[PDB]
Write a protein that binds this ligand. Structure first.
Ligand SMILES: Cc1nc2ccccc2c(=O)[nH]1
Length: 348
């Protein structure tokens, strides 16, 4: 009752058990054999190791049956329902990427559903108040006419890529967030140079986890797929690049995005896929060099932090496998989430 409507609107939204169920069904998971309440960490941890066993087998060149065994084992562990359609073999990069994408969501779906059942949920206290406390995060509404509000709205407007011409982004709510202990954790990197305010798009069902446990790196068991520069935390300077990872449908055009203080330091600027996790001496990050970059001449120093809100301009790089820039850090302590934005997607 006692929280601002937008802050409340956000809790019910991120803690929706019905939205969690929707995602499971969209991954073709058998909710009769694998309900929301059966999902466990060691089960998803096991599901990662099988995908890593699959990608190793395919690489080492295995036999139909031994490769088929891991496909059966994965589905036996994570009950799937394909109806009358035959179960698709997990024996290729597209097959593993799609299952690895699912586990990421299922990981943050578990972390969220566990929170909901956890705690001394009694009766007198408003469901919102109860759940907002469980995130261990100070969520405060940013005023419409504030300084930061104009900066954040300039950033959204100017960094929307010409390629991403399928929606128009519309800002609904801006929240100044501060995760419990994050500043104490980030403290060793606050002094570091090249600190930037960057974007991070993610599915709505993952935010109760993102605000609960912060932005995280894939576990060692996870297959090394989907991401261009290894297991690390990925950001964009282009809003629409991150906004794409909200997976907003025409029926559900409401999604959430992030702005985190990423302590980049000396960036190991690459142009083509390169798995590392272990950076080179003196480097603190990786920068995926894109053909299009926000105007470096139009940089802003909001709170002594670099904000590349420049209009989309082409960088002088053409020998690169990347359309737009991306940034990766391999230490979760180098991130410090500042804002959470509620965005409307207006499809053409
Ligand atoms: C999950 C995720 N991956 C990304 C990769 C590149 C750039 C941005 C993102 C992002 O925002 N979320």
């Amino acid at each position: 009752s006692k929280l601002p409507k937008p802050v409340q609107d956000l809790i019910k939204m991120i803690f929706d058990v019905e939205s969690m169920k929707k995602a499971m069904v969209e991954y073709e998971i058998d909710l009769q054999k694998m309900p929301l309440g059966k999902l466990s960490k060691r089960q998803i941890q096991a599901a990662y190791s099988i995908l890593s066993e699959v990608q190793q087998a395919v690489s080492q060149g295995s036999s139909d049956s031994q490769i088929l065994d891991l496909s059966n084992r994965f589905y036996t562990l994570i009950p799937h329902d394909f109806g009358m359609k035959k179960p698709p073999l997990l024996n290729n990069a597209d097959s593993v990427q799609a299952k690895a994408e699912m586990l990421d969501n299922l990981l943050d779906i578990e972390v969220a559903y566990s929170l909901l059942r956890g705690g001394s949920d009694d009766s007198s206290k408003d469901p919102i108040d109860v759940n907002y406390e469980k995130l261990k995060t100070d969520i405060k509404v940013v005023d419409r006419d504030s300084e930061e509000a104009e900066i954040i709205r300039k950033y959204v407007k100017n960094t929307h890529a010409t390629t991403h011409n399928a929606y128009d982004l519309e800002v609904i709510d801006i929240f100044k967030i501060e995760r419990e202990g994050e500043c104490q954790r980030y403290k060793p990197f606050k002094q570091l140079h090249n600190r930037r305010l960057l974007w991070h798009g993610s599915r709505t069902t993952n935010f109760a986890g993102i605000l609960s446990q912060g932005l995280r790196i894939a576990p060692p068991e996870a297959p090394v797929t989907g991401y261009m520069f290894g297991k690390g935390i990925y950001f964009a300077d282009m809003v629409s690049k991150s906004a794409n990872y909200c997976h907003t449908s025409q029926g559900d055009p409401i999604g959430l995005i992030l702005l985190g203080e990423v302590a980049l330091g000396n960036m190991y600027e690459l142009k083509h896929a390169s798995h590392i996790s272990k950076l080179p001496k003196g480097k603190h990050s990786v920068k995926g060099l894109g053909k299009t970059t926000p105007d470096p001449s139009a940089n802003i120093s909001l709170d002594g932090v670099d904000v590349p809100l420049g209009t989309g301009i082409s960088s002088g790089v053409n020998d690169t496998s990347l359309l737009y820039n991306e940034y990766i850090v391999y230490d979760i302590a180098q991130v410090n989430l500042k804002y959470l934005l509620k965005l409307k997607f207006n499809f053409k």
